[PDB]
Structure 1
Amino acid sequence: WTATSGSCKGRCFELQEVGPPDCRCDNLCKSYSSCCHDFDELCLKTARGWECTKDRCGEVRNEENACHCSEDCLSRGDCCTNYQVVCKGESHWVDDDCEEIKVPECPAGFVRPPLIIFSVDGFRASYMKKGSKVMPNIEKLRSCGTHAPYMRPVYPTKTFPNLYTLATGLYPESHGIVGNSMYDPVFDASFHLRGREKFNHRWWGGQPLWITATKQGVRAGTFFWSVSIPHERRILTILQWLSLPDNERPSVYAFYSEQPDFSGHKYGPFGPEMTNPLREIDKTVGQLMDGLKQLRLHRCVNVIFVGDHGMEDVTCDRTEFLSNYLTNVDDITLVPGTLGRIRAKSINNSKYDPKTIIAALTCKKPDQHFKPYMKQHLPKRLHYANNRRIEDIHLLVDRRWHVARKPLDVYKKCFFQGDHGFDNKVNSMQTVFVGYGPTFKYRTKVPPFENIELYNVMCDLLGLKPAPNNGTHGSLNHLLRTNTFRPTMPDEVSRPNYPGIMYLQSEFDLGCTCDDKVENKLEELNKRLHTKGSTKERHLLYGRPAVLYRTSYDILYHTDFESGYSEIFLMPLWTSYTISKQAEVSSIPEHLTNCVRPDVRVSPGFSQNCLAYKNDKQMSYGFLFPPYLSSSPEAKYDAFLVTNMVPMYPAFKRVWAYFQRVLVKKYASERNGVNVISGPIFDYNYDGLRDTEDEIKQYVEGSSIPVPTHYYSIITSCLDFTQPADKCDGPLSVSSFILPHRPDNDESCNSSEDESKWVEELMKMHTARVRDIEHLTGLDFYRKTSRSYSEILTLKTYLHTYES
């Protein structure tokens, strides 16, 4: 109940929250149906429109008018945005040449440059170039300020998950808005786009920018706008708030536009109808900048122009139906569209089985346009699993497609030509970032980056300490002229042991064998030097990774590779080696096919054993440093050490052997040498974070050898590929992957074919940032380079996407 009998007199767009049942006058009162009876008359005036004309100049103030052209309007802070152009001979902001803003030029009484976030729904990255002719205001912001060619959204590339990731710095799995539609099984409640459940504070987690600002004494405009409030009125409200007395005036503001998303859904991303919504957005930008110029704020305010996600061509005829796959379609609930999420229709149904559902959805039709996954098996780069609101079964839908339960859902619910939601590396889903103002750089292009990183920068722009989030603070310092945040490297927590030769061969009883008993002060001093680290500068190019948690581990050196061997997990945490462009690939000689060799630096009690692999009928083993890339026949023996061995399913060994035998050499050819760091990952609770020993759900049968959920590699070379990876003077280039360690290749529908037709495609799907690996392993890479630390942080957030 709302006692709508109160009044909005002197309260239009008030900032304080006012509680039930007293009526409201704020920018969301419409959406709640709680506005005072006179909100429309007083607060949403429309009379005479939004623009001054010659004859209104100097007019007698008439308070009924939407905006004013009277002489007192500047002091009242309510002129039409074009007042000074029409009535005082001024230019539009867009018509002025851009001039570097070296220092803020703010009016008396401004304690910091204000931040205005101009957010646009459905604004596809390629609109910046393709619509540039019809968007002169936005084009001036882009060209004169700091811009990226695109900004990567979070998955799913839906509206509320991305707007709230913008506000919080968090993955949707952490902030809790994992879809526009959700079911929370603990609340037993459904969240929808439409209706009242979404207003409940229990859905939204983390700490959004407006709350961070308020807790730290920086005042915030109300960021959200009811749909029926016209954009002109939104702009005028922001400009009015900017004329408040100093102690009342917010320092951070947001504008939101439902366009171009609204028309994009109707007409597709490049429909000819799309020009007009782009023109309209640009005019709104021009209104704001003109108004800032009137307030003498256009060289004081930092403006961010930022989108949530792109838009793809999608029509009704490109829908897959689950009724074409499942016998029992009525036993499931599907969340449909550009992603699918499946759960049981009734919790009392004991004949529900996720395994039979996944199997019935796996590689069933040759052209099949979605792929099913248990959520723990989704590419780790999506970070889309650790929340009870994400259903166990997920369908990753191909771009341009939908999934639905039954055909009647599509016609008895084409209506549309565009949609979004797909995998966040898809080019059509990319969106925009421009920053303009005294704190941003001048005419500067920055590489693409992820929207999770923006919250830290917005905190930096406002002098705020960010709440804990998933950005990597300092990774975007290159966007800023000042206010940079100068991080320090984490301290290493565990220091390694450096074992020498301490065990005789006969102390081991591992059940391993090797035909190695074939055999010189010349070559012996040499191999002793190798075991003490004499080649370590070649293979460990950026320093040893730091172990950021408490553990017990050994550094082991060899001719061709170096490793940090965990005595707790009985295998390396990391293995580092460099492969030059000139390096040669060799076979595993026939006498060495099954060779495993005890490591005399490491005790039997801290070693794996071959008997456990013989007895485990599901598990085989592979090696981290590949025997194919040995520098010489004699060095090859080091690759068969028990301390280089890791547990691998035979299906996974197909993937790993092709990567090691074929791909590493290909990368070394193409990139002029590569440095590789490989290793295991254990993430059994799918939280994106390194497991502790007591979280491990599976061991090699009969043993304490833990089975990895994933294997990673980080592959680094010189950005200037005219220099070899091992003699690089400048910035680096990196690509990485986190491959799921699965006992089948059901994910790859073409896997019965030769690895050359499917392995690299799998690896590309499981592309990762170095930072993703850091979280999953508790390691910190690139500790010793000649690069600035902020540049290294940017390198660790890079994602190699393989989109063209």
Structure 2
Amino acid sequence: QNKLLLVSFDGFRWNYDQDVDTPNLDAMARDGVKARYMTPAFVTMTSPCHFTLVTGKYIENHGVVHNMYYNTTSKVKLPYHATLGIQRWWDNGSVPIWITAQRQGLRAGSFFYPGGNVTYQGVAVTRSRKEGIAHNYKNETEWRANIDTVMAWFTEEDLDLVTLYFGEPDSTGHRYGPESPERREMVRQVDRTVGYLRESIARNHLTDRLNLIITSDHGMTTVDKRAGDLVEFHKFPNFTFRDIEFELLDYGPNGMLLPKEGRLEKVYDALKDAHPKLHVYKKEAFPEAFHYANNPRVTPLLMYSDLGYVIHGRINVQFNNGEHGFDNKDMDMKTIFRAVGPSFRAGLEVEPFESVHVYELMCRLLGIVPEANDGHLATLLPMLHTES
């Protein structure tokens, strides 16, 4: 059987390669498969979208509905890195691909991949690595070292599956913006890594035995600070934080709210028209096309703002030049899907598809029984050769 290596570069917008010299990605497009663009799951956050890739489920169904673990009763809200170690957040009734594969005789590994450093129903990933709290995500030398480790897992630890995560170009896109020269420099670094990745596959005699997927979780868009009609809760006349028992704001264009007992209607009628670029819903009325709201963890009130606008709560504390989390229909949020290997055709470009379908493909590539999921294998099966 063929091994599988899934690689994710966080926040790689579908067209980041169009205004950058990317020789190695162009070559991989010649040698393998490429989607015009891939539509991510909503919300377009790092952890929810990554867990979709390894479960084949929409976010409302696998339960990881936010980068931050939160608990409305206790008021705890843990940042992204801390949440990577909260077992109950990820082990909420869905089984990621590492565990499914290991229950069927395979050995799987996770390198910095979200959700890959916790147990699921008592089962641990065969090999797992998690970065430090102050990790540097753009050290190219450290990238090559991690790839060396991954190759050792395949060859010397007899692993059949590995999911490898990189935190760029997301970090750079946030700080400098997705249209900046810094981002393009980071995409050039990504492209040099793609080459090194394929170079390492060949050195280890795995070219004809290992399938490679290079994808990402979401895109990136510019946050214009010049704009004057900012979404600021502290300037809503009829709203008051005295009516709120729990809040999750100041986190991009997505907000959650739990009003105090009996004040839901008061809070809602005030916010439904507070700003023409903030869309506030009761949990039951949130559009179903997002496949996000129907989960017990979601609060009675949730909201999202228009492209290029973040949500400011009690006071403005956000300063990123680029952001994500917006409607997954927006082109700036679309991301990439690239693949090459013995199972994959060559020179093929397919029309766009939702990331919910990657899981079914990976299970077919591994030859394992998939968990029930929201995807359909027929979507991506045209990517693969016909067996004889």
User: What is the TM-score with the length of structure 2 in the denominator?
Assistant: 0.86
* 1:401 to partner: Cα distance: 0.1
Partner of 2:248: 335
* Paired position in structure 1 for 2:235: 324
Would you say the 8 A contact 2:70–2:78 is kept in 1?
A: no
In structure 2, relative to structure 1, the CA distance for the partners of 1:321 and 1:483 (3 Å cut) is: farther
Please list the CA deviations of residues 148-195 of structure 1 after superposition, one character each: whole Å capped at 9, or x if unmatched: 110010111010000111111111212111011243347x47352356
8 A Cα contact 1:146 1:442, kept in partner = yes
Alpha-carbon RMSD: 2.1
Give 2:280's aligned amino acid: P
After superposition, residues 196-275 of structure 1 pair within 5 angstroms as: 196=82, 198-204=84-90, 205=92, 206-224=94-112, 225-226=130-131, 227=135, 230-244=142-156, 248-275=157-184
**Compared with structure 1, are the counterparts of its residues 148 and 194 closer, same or farther at alpha carbon in structure 2 (3 Å cutoff)?**
closer
- Tell me which residue corresponds to 1:410: 317
Partner residue of 1:369 out of 267, 277, 301: 277
The answer to whether structure 1 residue 380 and structure 2 residue 288 are counterparts is yes
SS at match of 1:285: helix
Alignment pair present for 1:173 and 2:84: no
Q: Which runs of 4+ in 1 moved over 6 A?
A: none
| Residue 193 of structure 1 pairs with residue 79 of structure 2 | yes
How big is the shift at 1:335? 1.6
1:209 partner letter: I
Deviation per CA, 1:763-803, whole angstroms, max 9, x where unpaired? xxxxxxxxxxxxxxxxxxxxxxxxxxxxxxxxxxxxxxxxx
Alignment of 1:611-760 (within 5 A): none
Q: Which amino acid aligns with 1:323?
A: H
- Of 300, 314, 334, which aligns to 1:430? 334
Give aligned-pair identity as a percent. Answer: 33
Structure 2 CA distance for partners of 1:293 and 1:153, relative to 1, 3 Å: same
Of the candidates 165, 186, 189, which is equivalent to residue 280 of structure 1?
A: 189
From the superposition, tell whether residues 410 and 222 of structure 1 become closer, same or farther in structure 2 (CA, over 3 Å). Answer: closer
Q: Could you say which residue in structure 1 is the equivalent of 2:267?
A: 357
* Shift in CA distance, 359/239, structure 1 to aligned 2, threshold 3 Å: same
Q: Are 2:108 and 2:159, in contact at CA under 8 Å, matched by a contact in 1?
A: yes
Q: Tell me, what secondary structure is at the counterpart of 2:345?
A: coil
TM-score (norm 1): 0.43
2:2 counterpart residue number: 113
> What is the SS of the residue equivalent to 2:108?
coil
Q: Say whether the 8 Å CA contact 1:192–1:198 is kept in structure 2.
A: no
Task: Compute the displacement of 1:483 (Å).
Answer: 6.7
**Pick from 351, 356, 379: which aligns with 1:452?**
356
Change in Cα spacing, 1:254 to 1:364, as seen in structure 2 (3 Å) is closer
For residue 235 of structure 1, report the CA deviation from its aligned partner. Answer: 0.7
State whether residues 316 and 416 of structure 1, in contact with CA within 8 Å, keep that contact through their aligned partners in structure 2: no
Change (3 A) 1:191 1:410: closer
Quick one: distance in 2 between partners of 1:237 and 1:189? 39
Q: Does 1:163 align with 2:50?
A: yes
| 1:404 to 1:483, Cα distance in 2 relative to 1, 3 A | farther
Q: Structure 1, residues 369-410: CA drift from partner, whole Å, max 9, x if none?
A: 11111122122111112222111111121000011123x342
What is the aligned length?
Answer: 356
Query: 1:4-43: CA deviations, max 9, x gaps?
Result: xxxxxxxxxxxxxxxxxxxxxxxxxxxxxxxxxxxxxxxx
User: Given that residues 181 and 190 in structure 1 are in contact (C-alpha distance below 8 angstroms), is that contact kept between their aligned partners in structure 2?
Assistant: no
- Tell me, what secondary structure is at the counterpart of 2:255? strand
**Structure 1: gaps spanning 5 or more residues:** 1-111, 485-804
Contact kept, 8 Å, 2:17 with 2:187, in 1: the verdict is: no
**Separation of aligned partners in 2, 1:418 and 1:228:** 19
Larger relative contact order, structure 1 or 2 (CA cutoff 8 Å, min sep 6) = 2
- Specify the code of the residue in structure 2 equivalent to 1:129: Q
Matching of residues 88-107 of structure 1 within 5 Å = none
1:242 alignment partner, SS class: helix
Correspondences of 1:544-623 after superposition (within 5 Å): none
For structure 2, the residue ranges without an aligned partner over 5 or more in a row are 113-129
